[PDB]
Design a protein around this ligand. Structure first.
Ligand SMILES: [Mg+2]
Ligand SMILES: [Mg+2]
Ligand SMILES: [Mg+2]
Ligand SMILES: [Mg+2]
Ligand SMILES: [Mg+2]
Ligand SMILES: [Mg+2]
Ligand SMILES: [Mg+2]
Ligand SMILES: [Mg+2]
Ligand SMILES: [Mg+2]
Ligand SMILES: [Mg+2]
Ligand SMILES: [Mg+2]
Ligand SMILES: [Mg+2]
Ligand SMILES: [Mg+2]
Ligand SMILES: [Mg+2]
Ligand SMILES: [Mg+2]
Ligand SMILES: [Mg+2]
Ligand SMILES: [Mg+2]
Length: 148
RNA sequence: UUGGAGAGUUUGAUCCUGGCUCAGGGUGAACGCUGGCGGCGUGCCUAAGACAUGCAAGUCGUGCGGGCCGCGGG
């Protein structure tokens, strides 16, 4: 099993004659607090199905984040559309310093020490993905040498 | 590398741009409601407007010559 957090749940709507009709959107991150996180956004005619379906995709999309004493190996900046995420290495005491969105991802990934900043569009969805694709580009001292 | 959190609000809904707004810290402060004690600070930011009264720069007889009161005594 995995540990799960609901980052976002939103109602959307579409028009047709006679009225508007809703659908729900569930941004869920899921992880083991020991180097494995997954982000999934799930939509359905009702709330919990969406939260379920979210969690489903969440697993069907993971990433192996190279923790290091609970911090990430290096500075990293990523832009997903107009959203930007900054990740910066932090020493033992620091805590996770971030907004909920990139927090929820970093805690459930087992980060315990990091400095972050959102820049640009701070739409949670895009920020979510931007933080994921960020982690996904983390490299270790090894990773680099093997590569080169 | 001791360091970096964001949120509300444009739409039926969306993403973006973009302003407004907020939570933080700060002060020679002021206003309200309330008000027990102590310590260290600290208190005319405006009229460099106008000020009653006291006080804030004096001292030396080991520079000099006198006055006035007294002490010692012809
Ligand atoms: Mg890896
Ligand atoms: Mg974006
Ligand atoms: Mg851009
Ligand atoms: Mg280091
Ligand atoms: Mg925002
Ligand atoms: Mg409005
Ligand atoms: Mg418009
Ligand atoms: Mg509205
Ligand atoms: Mg805004
Ligand atoms: Mg008062
Ligand atoms: Mg009173
Ligand atoms: Mg006093
Ligand atoms: Mg003055
Ligand atoms: Mg005048
Ligand atoms: Mg006058
Ligand atoms: Mg005096
Ligand atoms: Mg002399």
């Amino acid at each position: 099993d995995f540990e799960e957090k609901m980052i976002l749940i939103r109602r959307t709507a579409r028009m047709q004659a006679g009225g508007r009709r809703f659908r729900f959107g569930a941004l869920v991150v899921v992880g083991d607090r020991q180097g494995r996180v997954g982000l999934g956004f799930g939509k359905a005619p009702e709330v919990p199905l969406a939260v379920q379906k979210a969690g489903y995709y969440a697993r069907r999309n993971m990433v192996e984040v190279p923790l290091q004493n609970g911090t990430i190996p290096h500075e990293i900046e990523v832009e997903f559309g107009a959203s930007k995420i900054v990740l910066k290495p932090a020493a033992p005491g620091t805590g996770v310093i971030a907004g909920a969105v990139p927090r929820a991802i970093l805690e459930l990934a087992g980060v315990t020490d990091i400095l972050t900043k959102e820049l640009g569009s701070r739409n949670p969805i895009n920020i979510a993905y931007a933080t994921m694709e960020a982690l996904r580009q983390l490299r270790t001292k090894a990773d680099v040498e093997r590569l080169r």
